[PDB]
Amino acid sequence: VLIPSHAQGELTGRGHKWLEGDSLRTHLTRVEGWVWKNRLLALAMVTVVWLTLESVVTRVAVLVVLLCLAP
Amino acid sequence: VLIPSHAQGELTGRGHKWLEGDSLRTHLTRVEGWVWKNRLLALAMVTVVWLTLESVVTRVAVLVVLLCLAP
Amino acid sequence: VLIPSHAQGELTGRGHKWLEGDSLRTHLTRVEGWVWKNRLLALAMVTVVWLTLESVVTRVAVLVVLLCLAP
Amino acid sequence: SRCTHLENRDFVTGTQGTTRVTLVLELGGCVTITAEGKPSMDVWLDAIYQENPAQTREYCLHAKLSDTKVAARCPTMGPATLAEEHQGGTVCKRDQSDRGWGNHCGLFGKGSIVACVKAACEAKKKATGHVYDANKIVYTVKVEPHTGDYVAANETHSGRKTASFTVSSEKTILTMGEYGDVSLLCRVASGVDLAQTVILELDKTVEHLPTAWQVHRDWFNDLALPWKHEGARNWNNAERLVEFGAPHAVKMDVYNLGDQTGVLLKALAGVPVAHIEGTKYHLKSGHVTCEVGLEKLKMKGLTYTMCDKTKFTWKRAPTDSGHDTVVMEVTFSGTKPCRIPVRAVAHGSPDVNVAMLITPNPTIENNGGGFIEMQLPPGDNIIYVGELSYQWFQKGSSIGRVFQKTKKGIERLTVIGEHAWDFGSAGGFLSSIGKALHTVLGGAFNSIFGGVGFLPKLLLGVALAWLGLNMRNPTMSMSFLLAGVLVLAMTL
Amino acid sequence: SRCTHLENRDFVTGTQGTTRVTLVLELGGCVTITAEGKPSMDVWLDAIYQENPAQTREYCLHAKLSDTKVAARCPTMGPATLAEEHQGGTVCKRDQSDRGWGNHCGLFGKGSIVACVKAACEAKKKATGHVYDANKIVYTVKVEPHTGDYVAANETHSGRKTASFTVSSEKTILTMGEYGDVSLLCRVASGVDLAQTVILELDKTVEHLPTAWQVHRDWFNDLALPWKHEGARNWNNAERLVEFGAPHAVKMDVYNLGDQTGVLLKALAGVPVAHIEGTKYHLKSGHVTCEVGLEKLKMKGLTYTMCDKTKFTWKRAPTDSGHDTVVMEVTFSGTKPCRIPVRAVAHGSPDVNVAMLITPNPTIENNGGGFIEMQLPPGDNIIYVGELSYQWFQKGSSIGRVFQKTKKGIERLTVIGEHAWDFGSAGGFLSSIGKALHTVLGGAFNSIFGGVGFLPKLLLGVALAWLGLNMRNPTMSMSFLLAGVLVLAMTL
Amino acid sequence: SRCTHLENRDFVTGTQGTTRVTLVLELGGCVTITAEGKPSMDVWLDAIYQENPAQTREYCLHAKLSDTKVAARCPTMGPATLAEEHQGGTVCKRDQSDRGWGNHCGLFGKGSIVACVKAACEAKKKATGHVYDANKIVYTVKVEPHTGDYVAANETHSGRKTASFTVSSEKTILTMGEYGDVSLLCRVASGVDLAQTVILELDKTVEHLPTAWQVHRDWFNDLALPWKHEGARNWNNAERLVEFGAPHAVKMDVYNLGDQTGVLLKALAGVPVAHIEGTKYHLKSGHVTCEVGLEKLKMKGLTYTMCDKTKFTWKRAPTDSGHDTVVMEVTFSGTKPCRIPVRAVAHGSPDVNVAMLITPNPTIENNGGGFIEMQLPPGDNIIYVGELSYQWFQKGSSIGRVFQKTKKGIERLTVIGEHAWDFGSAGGFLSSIGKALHTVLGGAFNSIFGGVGFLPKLLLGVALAWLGLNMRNPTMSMSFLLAGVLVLAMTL
Ligand SMILES: *[C@@H]1O[C@H](CO)[C@@H](O)[C@H](O)[C@H]1NC(C)=O
Ligand SMILES: *[C@@H]1O[C@H](CO)[C@@H](O)[C@H](O)[C@H]1NC(C)=O
Ligand SMILES: *[C@@H]1O[C@H](CO)[C@@H](O)[C@H](O)[C@H]1NC(C)=O
């Protein structure tokens, strides 16, 4: 059923391809898609930063991952 | 020569006006205009935050004002 | 809509220009414009000087800025 | 009903005993008066105008320059003069040039030079102001009864009566067909603050512009353009559109600053427009606190029989009204006139009519009737018109409609509502205290802070808030209360 | 001499051995080259133009609107479309109105509405830009020798030779009559930075305006007006002059923003003007670093006799020159040609000639000659022309003239002088180091701070100065040096 | 009995006095109403449809491209334009290429290039949406009495009555032959949430696909494909199927993205299907809370005699029903009509009838009767029909059937059961509190977490659980309760 994407291989190239920027930036529009639809949850993850962990180096390690985990 | 703006008066209104949002947001596109043209200076004002003052309540009082001072 | 002013560029000049003094002094007639219309507020900012801060070097840093912030 | 047409609408109740109602007829609104035993009325403010008012300062937005005359003298040879250095509507500027032997002078240094142009004005480029004489202003209140018919905006309703209100009117008794009479007492004095309102007018014959505007007095009298009055041949401060270049020792160039219409139109960011119709100068934003007497009203058709319960159909199905009410239109086919058996039960098999009607005693007439407006409680409801039942789910909530009116009531309290606590009637320790606790505060922060704008109000309040953080005396630490006012009160 | 006409003038010396002089021919100036044994020359930049250059983005300052077409739909009846939502030069805006039964819709809520107008442009209201192709630009340098005649500005001098300088010119040998030849090597590449210069043009047929302007590239490409190119039928971003009111559910009003000429002319505060002459697009501000060879020059009339010491008179008496020099014109009546015995003693009956001449070897010709320019020391002086003595009091001071040139030299160091250390010739550890110590600093604070203006430079410098007052590290307390730069360097 | 055909089945009891029963007729279910003294009825929801509803946004899944036209310009020669940059249904993209001397340009750098194609749509590749108008939706409830006959699915039962339920219906009295009458009050408003339901339709003439679907509103209005409405000639966002390659300085290639049907069909993983029959757009998943009145019912054949105890045989032997009940069919040969002496004793020689019947008063008629359904207690049972005894071992347990209904009751509490606490009747502190304790919680975690999916619900709940492990305040350690909700509640 499911065909996996071929951003795994990425052999070579100086000719022509399909989507140079959209191989990376569709993953940067899903994440921006999560924010504008869930503003109540985008502010809910601010409670992680200044209240729970207080571990600045590893605060960002929770923020970036949990947004990327939501597909 | 100069005609001053009439966001000063602001009597009433339930009929029709010109620009409800653009009375405020033209002042919010000048400031966004300052940033995208002066990216090297936008990062230069980060040196105020974590290096010079270290006075979190009054760090923002320098940042917001000096951006609004540039017309 | 908005055309920004070209006191930003200021290339050169030994021929003729428009307004050598009024590039600077229209910003000095706005400020004089704020005073004569708001005499009750011009005296209200005297309460900053001798009552609240009492920090002569930085008294003027509030006075000059807050007048220039009002466009 | 005109109140069903537009968005803004307010309902006013009245019990047995409530016969004098004090409204605030704001322009571009509609008020539905409901009273127990009385036919419900729709009263709104229609128009505010004055035929041919007095006109203050004009302006010139595009200077018409002609007859450039320049004279110059050698540096020790009697500084230059002209005949046009005194005549009306002539801009002149003296300057010192650099006379050489190229332009035939015995010595060098700084020779005098002066230029003069005739500063006329371009046709149809005048910013003509206008002000309202309180003795000749004409308010206009129209009252429409809920007849049970429906009339669209293209059409004109029959029973819609119109009452003008100058300063020389105290009370108007309106013959409302068969529903009785209504009395309207309009405080024409306490309407729009006419002292601080100037009707700005450009070329009204231009197609794609508003015909007029409505600006504050202090803004209009402090422009920096050329100005005159009616009948004046020549301008004042005519140099404000004319700039002179530095001379090249024989000629000093004269530069116009072109049209100024674009700068003026950008300066009116957030100004309510005003319409000009022929000679009448209307407004599109204003209010007046008229008082409505209800003692001379009566319902129409209480002596009529009930209709047949079978013979109802629909010209138009029931639907939501956008004001948490329900509107519909039935069609009757039997003998006319008769009263329409309208009821609605929620859900208990209760036989309990919970349809709080807006149009009271709905009656089919010999040539009209059928439009029925009601307000239902939230939840599942079954609307009955005789033997004609319809399911309905009222989309509101229990606290939803109470939270609706407070969202209205706060936005009622704009600068209109700064004046208007009087939307009720004789509150005493409720509403008459509201006038006291607000006029001494609102009037105080209108004398100061009046003509400063959104951004300084959002700045100076924060500045006085920041002084609350760093303050010596705990007694003087109550300047934090201004953050409770300046950041909140005059920011809506 | 053309250098005697205008105010701005610079003298350049040259010793025995100095034969190659590197000038900076700035426009609206005049340079007098003086060399020992050589006839003195006046070299200036005359004009900078290009016949019919390529034109970039046009603009529209006054939108011409026509054919308002509005369509609307009931709130669940297929959101509104029009044929003019695709056609060229048409501004459209979609909005949600409030459809009632007044405008005949089955339901309530938010009905779609959209209006479209044909956004043409008014005639002669276009802000046409123009740019300079470096391959087709024409500099123009004129050289006039000090012939001893005098020619006013209305008249044209005989020996004034003119040399054009395109990109395709290396060196031009000019036949200067009998004074010899002069060679001019103009760096046409390193003149005005043509990459960042746009000639703005409005309606040039308007009387009381400059014909053109000279704006920065980054300013001109970041306007917020409608724009197109040459030959394009329809505009882009045409909605920037058209604003739409909130609709009243059937019609949405379309409002023009009028002319925008006034906003544009106020935006050019401190912009150097530019002239258009027919097809040629001149400039009135610029510079070029041409190099002058002096090896093929010789004085004229060393073989002539001396004049009779008695037969001199005056066409024009001696007078001040405004450049701390003295100018005059004698008239000879004997046999011509001959050399004029010019000398001037200060005060000792010393017979010591202190008249540092500017016109070397003054000679009366068969049809002209007599104009003599000299520089005298401060104090009482007696000028001799044969047997013709005149008292003179030189109005300057000892340190006054040295303090004069430094006041010149600082104002030489404008943005022209930011480029121009090369007004001398091969300084090595004087001038070639000046290029090094300034380009890496001036170029650094042009990349940043380039396009910020006077007021932020006078503010952000003080802000970085104030951080010097409150700084932790004494090593990092050298941010006070920016107050020594930002308050001083880019504030002139 | 239709309830014997399908898997899902619910039994509803009723005592002497229980006459109003509130059901939740979920589609693809069957409810057997049992009441003491009343004949048992089978009431189910049959179909939910609307003839020719209004259709919202269409889509295009396969772009039909034609007329590729490309124009390009040399890098300072007026950026490229085309006539098809404005026409409807045309995708265009501007780009900067690299013009050389190979393609004949005077300069190098970045030359403009633009291509335009006509973006039509392929036939029968449209994802046509449809929505349900609540005023025209038609629920359909069928009621079948337990007649004692049996009718298979291929056949149609005689006494099966059908009652439609639009918005314009209150109550329907159904003539159930000789069993009496039944009243059905269907809350048509509170059925399927029609505001958030869109019937998606592809090419319905395709053989091996469902004819339609049923998607959420927020999902359907946020697709990223080209779309239009009914009657619209040209598409919107037509570039979402067309991608352009980087040009080789003269031609820019235009690439279609082919059919998109496969991507759409994979996106509907776990979407309930919907059937289209001619013009009617059915559903295959939904519910409605109809209320059943039982006061106008009576048993049939109480006046009849008892049958002969000898003359019973079998058309079909007793067997399990898959609902912990027992079904069978006898055949009588004596005089008709008569009542069938049905009883069943467990094990005691007890003469105690423990056969809780489902079909009450089983009677052989003159042309039918014999189908008998009963529920027996767990263990060894002997079923008697006169003198016709059969062993039976009821396979359930004592607590097994109670644990069966709670396994039903939890899976009753799906999103249907989130609405449905009302399967009983007037619980007060049992069921009416159930509506209160669930709507404020279920509605809260539908506003947030609504449209996030199984995997983040199984992740974000564990994340908030993990914050419970490392929490400062014991008062704020009650965020572990969300692990009791988010891992459990919205994971079934
Ligand atoms: C009523 O409105 C409709 C809108 O289509 C219009 O056609 C008609 O002319 C209007 N009636 C009158 C009397 O203006
Ligand atoms: C140039 O010479 C003419 C000849 O008489 C004289 O009239 C004129 O004044 C001169 N031009 C100027 C600008 O002075
Ligand atoms: C009932 O189903 C059987 C299956 O064999 C079939 O023979 C019969 O035709 C069906 N009855 C009807 C009325 O279709």
Numbering used by the authors:
A (entry chain F), B (entry chain D), C (entry chain E): 2 to 72
D (entry chain B), E (entry chain A), F (entry chain C): 1 to 492
Article, verbatim:
TBEV belongs to the family Flaviviridae of positive-sense, single-stranded RNA viruses. In contrast to the principles suggested by Caspar and Klug and unlike most isometric viruses, the three E-protein subunits within one icosahedral asymmetric unit form unique interactions with the surrounding glycoproteins. Both E-proteins and M-proteins are anchored in the virion membrane, each by two trans-membrane helices. Two M-proteins and two E-proteins form a heterotetramer in which each M-protein interacts with both E-proteins.
Nevertheless, the structure of the mature TBEV particle was determined to a resolution of 3.9 Å. The surface of the TBEV virion is covered with small protrusions formed by glycans attached to the E-protein subunits. Whereas in the crystal structure the domains I, II, and III are arranged in a line, in the virion the tip of domain II is bent 15 Å toward the virus membrane. The bending of the ectodomain in the virion is necessary to keep the fusion loop buried in the hydrophobic pocket of the other E-protein from the same dimer, so that the loop is prevented from untimely induction of membrane fusion.
